[PDB]
Structures are given as C-alpha cells and as structure tokens.
Design a protein around this ligand. Structure first.
Ligand SMILES: CCc1ccccc1-c1ccc(CNCCc2nc3ccccc3[nH]2)cc1C
Ligand SMILES: CCc1ccccc1-c1ccc(CNCCc2nc3ccccc3[nH]2)cc1C
Length: 327
C-alpha cells in the first residue's frame, strides 16, 4: 500500500478546534434577503458559477454576487463554512451574504466588491517588481488559510482578483477548498488540469496544503516565462508527461518509490525517459526582464515532485525573491 504522509506544518489545527469549525455538514445556513440586491453588470464566467457586479439596495454599496450552478450549489455548506472561518483574514475574499432565488431555487453568495483590473492587461504588463509584490500578497492568503487548517485546492490566476490601482489582491472561489485532517484520503479530482500537483496526477490521496504551493509555482512559471499555462497537458495523464518533460523522470520515480505509489499501467510507456531541464533554458529576449537568479531559485523550491519538500507559504515569504518588496 502507499506510504502515508502528513503536512510538515499546521497538522494539529483542526483537532484543537471545536467540531463546529470543520464539521460543515452540521452548519445551519441563515438565509439573507435576495430582494436586497439589484444586478448591474456581468464580469465572470467561472466553471459552475456566474459573477455579477450588484448594488446592495439597503446600503447603496457595490457588491459581487456569485450565482451557483447545481454542481457548486451541492457543496454550499462547505464553501460557506470555509468562507466564514477565513473571513477577515489577509487577502481573503469577504462573504457578505447567502441568498436564494425563490423563482429558480438557485443559491448565491454575496461578497465585498473588488474593482478588478482586466486579467489580460495584468498578465501582459505587470513588471518584475509587481509580480514579486502580488506573489507576496498571494502567500499572505495561503499562509493564512493553511494556518486555519484549510487547503484552497484550486489556486490559479482565475481565482485571484487584483485591483491594480489600489494594489489590492483577493484569493477567491473557495468552492473546492477542504479542511485538512492528517491521514485523510482526499479526492484527487480537484484544482484545474494545468495547476494539478503530481500527487493528484499519480492518484496519491493523502495530500495536504503543499498542493497549493505546486499550483502557485505553476502560476509563477507561466508569468515569468511568458507561457500560459506553463504545463499544457491535453488530459490528466499527458499533464504528468508535460511536467516530466521539464522536471525529469528520475526525480518522478524517486517520488513514487519514496511513497510506494503504484502508477497506472498506461503511464510507463507514455512517461518515457526525460532529463531534468535547467530553468535557464526557458529564458529568452522577451522574458529576460522578468527572470532573475532569485526567481529561478524560488520557482525551483515550489516546483518539486515531493510534496513534503516544497517550501511552505511561510518559508516562501522569507525567500530572497521578496527582499525587494516594500514591507
Ligand atoms: C499568471 C498569473 C499570475 C502570476 C503571478 C502573479 C500574478 C498573476 C495574476 C493573478 C491574477 C490575475 C487576474 N485574475 C482575474 C481573474 C478573475 N477575474 C474575475 C472577474 C469576475 C469573476 C471571476 C474572476 N476571476 C492576473 C495575474 C497576472
Ligand atoms: C435572479 C438572480 C438570483 C440568483 C440567485 C440568488 C438570488 C438572485 C436574486 C433574486 C432576486 C433579486 C432581486 C436579486 C438577486 C441577486
């Protein structure tokens, strides 16, 4: 059988909490009034959700309304519990209300307003300094949620909102997040394909917060190398192949050997044999302005097969890549 694993930080947080903190199934949902909101304009598409800019008619303030499609609606109590648990934490989106449409019976989550900067402009124009600044803001949110015993499990640019004018960042869409309990075997059908950690791709269920750090490394690699996504897999098996073509197969095998992971028969002939590539190989005239020895060192410490060997969010904040960032 696979060798068990546990996080190297925040392992005990959920055992020292009352059952109501993590037992989301027991939570009773207090429904607000849907008549309190008037829909202004759409700016989101998501996966199983539609996002609108609205006005809360009781205080004339702008809000964000997330209407949930049936898939997301099924796990509402978990998303509500996590959002309520993290409310007020650094760079965490603020849940303001929970409403239900009496016509369609579909629920919605209402959040604080974020005046988002166009996502393409951000990808195309953020400087080296800005990337370090916002990567640091993302680490604040991840260290906070991990410290609160929660893994996001869907870290990707679509789930990070940035108001560049106010240098304001929020980590959003906690619909896939879960409470971390040591020894628990989780569903590996999480995150979005391009950001899935090797643990998910090889069906290693006993993962932890460190999955978020792999996804964060995928975002960083895409940004500094100007390749979106960085690991462009055609499907979940090919995803691992794309990863192995950069990180190499030797280390992949060492990882599966360390945890006694049984690989899927169809991987052995498709994984082939690949050497570990030097990060400097992805550096070109059009991306040299975003790359530094510190950025490559940092990236190297996130993009590791062994989930136990990746920097934690708190360790990542101490990295030299952030020394330039005004704190
Ligand atoms: C490579 C991504 C990256 C790497 C390193 C540092 C920053 C980034 C990054 C992160 C996020 C964004 C902007 N993401 C907006 C997505 C979004 N808008 C929404 C509006 C409505 C509903 C849902 C939404 N969801 C941009 C960058 C550059
Ligand atoms: C039909 C939009 C909607 C979807 C899901 C939940 C609530 C609403 C809703 C209904 C009525 C009014 C006014 C406002 C909202 C947001």
């Amino acid at each position: 059988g696979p060798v068990p694993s546990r996080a190297r930080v925040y392992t005990d947080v959920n055992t020292h909490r009352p059952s109501e903190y993590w037992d989301y199934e027991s939570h009773v949902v207090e429904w607000g009034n849907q008549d309190d909101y008037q829909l202004v304009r759409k700016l989101g598409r998501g996966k199983y959700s539609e996002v609108f800019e609205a006005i809360n008619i009781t205080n004339n303030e702008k809000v964000v309304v997330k209407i949930l499609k049936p898939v997301a609606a099924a796990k509402i109590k978990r998303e509500i519990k996590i959002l309520e648990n993290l409310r007020g934490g650094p760079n965490i989106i603020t849940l303001a209300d929970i409403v239900k449409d009496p016509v369609s019976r579909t629920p919605a989550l209402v959040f604080e307003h974020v005046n988002n900067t166009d996502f393409k402009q951000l990808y195309q124009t953020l400087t080296d300094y800005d990337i370090r600044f916002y990567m640091y803001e993302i680490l604040k949110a991840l260290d906070y949620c991990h410290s609160m015993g929660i893994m996001h499990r869907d870290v990707k640019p679509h789930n990070v909102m940035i108001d560049h004018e106010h240098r304001k960042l929020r980590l959003i869409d906690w619909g896939l997040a879960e409470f971390y309990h040591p020894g628990q075997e989780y569903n590996v059908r999480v995150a979005s394909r391009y950001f899935k950690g090797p643990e998910l791709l090889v069906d290693y269920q006993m993962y932890d917060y460190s999955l978020d750090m792999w996804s964060l490394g995928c975002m960083l690699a895409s940004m500094i190398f100007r390749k979106e996504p960085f690991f462009h897999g055609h499907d979940n098996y090919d995803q691992l192949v794309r990863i192995a073509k950069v990180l190499g197969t030797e280390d992949l095998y060492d990882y599966i050997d360390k945890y006694n992971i049984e690989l899927d028969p169809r991987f052995n002939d498709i994984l082939g044999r690949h050497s570990r590539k030097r990060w400097e190989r992805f550096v070109h005239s059009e991306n040299q302005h975003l790359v530094s020895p510190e950025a490559l060192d940092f990236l190297d410490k996130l993009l590791r097969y062994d989930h136990q060997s990746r920097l934690t969010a708190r360790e990542a904040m101490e990295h030299p890549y952030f020394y330039t960032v005004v704190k």
